[PDB]
Amino acid sequence: DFLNSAMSSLYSGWSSFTTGASK
Structure with missing residues (x-):
């Protein structure tokens, strides 16, 4: 997860x- x-x-x-899809 850290690498994320x-x-x-x-x-x-x-x-x-991209946060929209990442979050």
């Missing part, structure tokens, strides 16, 4: 939208 966080900071940082 380091990923959100990379994918959920440039798109600032």
